[PDB]
Structure formats: C-alpha cells, structure tokens
Amino acid sequence: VEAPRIRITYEKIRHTKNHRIVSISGPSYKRMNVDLIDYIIRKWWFAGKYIYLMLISSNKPTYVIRTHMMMHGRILVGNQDSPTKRAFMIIQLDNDIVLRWYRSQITLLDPNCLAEIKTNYTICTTRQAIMDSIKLMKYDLSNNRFDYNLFQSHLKNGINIHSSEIITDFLLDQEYFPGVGNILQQEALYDCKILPLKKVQDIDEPMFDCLCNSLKKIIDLLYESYKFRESGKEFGPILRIYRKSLCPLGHKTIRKKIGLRNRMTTWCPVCQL
Ligand SMILES: [Zn+2]
Numbered sequence: 001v002e003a004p005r006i007r008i009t010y011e012k013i014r015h016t017k018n019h020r021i022v023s024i025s026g027p028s029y030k031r032m033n034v035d036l037i038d039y040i041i042r043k044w045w046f047a048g049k050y051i052y053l054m055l056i057s058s059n060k061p062t063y064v065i066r067t068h069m070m071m072h073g074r075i076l077v078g079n080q081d082s083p084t085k086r087a088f089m090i091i092q093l094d095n096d097i098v099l100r101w102y103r104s105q106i107t108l109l110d111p112n113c114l115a116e117i118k119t120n121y122t123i124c125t126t127r128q129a130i131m132d133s134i135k136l137m138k139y140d141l142s143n144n145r146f147d148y149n150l151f152q153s154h155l156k157n158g159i160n161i162h163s164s165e166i167i168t169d170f171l172l173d174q175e176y177f178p179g180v181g182n183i184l185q186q187e188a189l190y191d192c193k194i195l196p197l198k199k200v201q202d203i204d205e206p207m208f209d210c211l212c213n214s215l216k217k218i219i220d221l222l223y224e225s226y227k228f229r230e231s232g233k234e235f236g237p238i239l240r241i242y243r244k245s246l247c248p249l250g251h252k253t254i255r256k257k258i259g260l261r262n263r264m265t266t267w268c269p270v271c272q273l
Helices: 005-016 027-032 126-139 148-161 167-171 182-191 205-230
Strands: 021-025 040-047 050-056 063-078 089-093 098-109 116-118 123-125 254-258 263-267
Touching (some): 005 040, 167 182
Antiparallel strands (some): 254 263
C-alpha cells in the first residue's frame, strides 16, 4: 500500500472523529495490552505509509494508535453485520459504525514514552516518533499539508547524504519520500527515462525536478482514478511499466530485485539509460 491509498483510507474513516469506543477486540488489540473502552476518537492524520489515531479519555492517559497497512492491508468501515473473519482489530463506535483492520501492523504509541523504537526511517523515542509524523506530513506528496519549498530544501540534503546509493533505494526512503512505494518509484523512473541502477550523485538538477514532478503526477492520476470509481465511472489504465513484458514503445523489459531494499523493479534498458 502506497500513496495515495493512505490518503484515501484516511478520507474514508476520518468522520469517525468525536465518537466513543463502545467495544474493541482482536489479536492486535490484545497485543497492545491497554483497555481502550469508552475512549474518544480525537483526531486522525496520516504521513507517508502511516495512519495515526489519537484517543483521549477524561483523567486517563492519551494514546496514539499507528497503523501501517501491509500488502492487501485495509481499514474498512462497516457495521455489526459485516464479516469479521481474519480481522486484526475491531472497533465498534457509539453510532453503530464498525472499523475493521486487515493485514496491517498496528502499534500503540504513548506520547509520554521515552523508549527507543524503530520506525521506517529512523530509531527514536516513542514521543519523538509522534512529533516527527507532524513534520513528515509536509514531505508527503499526496498530503494536503505538502509544502513544496520545504520539501525541496529537505530533498537537497538527502541527495547529498545518500549520494552513493542507487535511485530506486533513494526513492523508497521514507524520510525523504514518505508514501512512495514500489509501483510509484518504477513508474516515475520510466516516465523520466532514468535507469533504476543509476546512482543518486549521477542525476542532475533538471532530472531530480523531473522525478518529483513525475511522482506527483502519477499520484494525481491514481487519486483521480479513485474519484472516477467513486462516481461509478472508469478512468482507464495508467500504469506503463509495472509488471509489463513490453514497454509501450515495444522494447523487451528487464525485471529483477535491486538495491539494498531488494525490491522487484521492471525497467526498459533502451528507454531508461
Ligand atoms: Zn522501451
């Protein structure tokens, strides 16, 4: 799951805000080892591949639930009737709405906790992880809080730091491209005719700008495709290189795992040089 699916999920569930938890269950809930009955949903937000849920209750500690949706991971809105099978967590609210988590990493974050944890971009305290999420929203290409100028400045630092690694590895760095996943990175690389094996240091100013524009364009297209489906329409195909045997020009493609991340990338050796 990658952008803009995280935003889409957020937009679908955020109107559960201000409602009370009547019942809650599932293995992922038990694992957190905290009673959340009668807590109130204060706020939802998202940053990259993380969706955050703030829960409050009078005279009780505030908690944040962090969700990382894995492959075929979803948070679904339903009711008591809906099937619960295979769901990691079930939350029923006071208005009979039921939220169901599937195939997701679910973590309790205590904002007052100073224990060190590993996130998808660093190692930091639990408290710092929550604070960082607020800052990382500005770097999320699909987020409404995206800040172009701050993103560009931030990106320039990362280009200097990760100069030695291949471009695919850098495009998947969740500190600099939060929300970007395997499909986006290779679609963008083909769109800009850049070889995935090319090092970051060997990419010039206009082409990094080119990559960022391509990434945001494809995210826009994916989001627009969702908007079409919602109204009962079909937007049409938009993928050009993902799992394709032939590039749209007709060249034979190469498909293998690359980089330290070892993610499977399809590229055209002719078009992308
Ligand atoms: Zn080609």
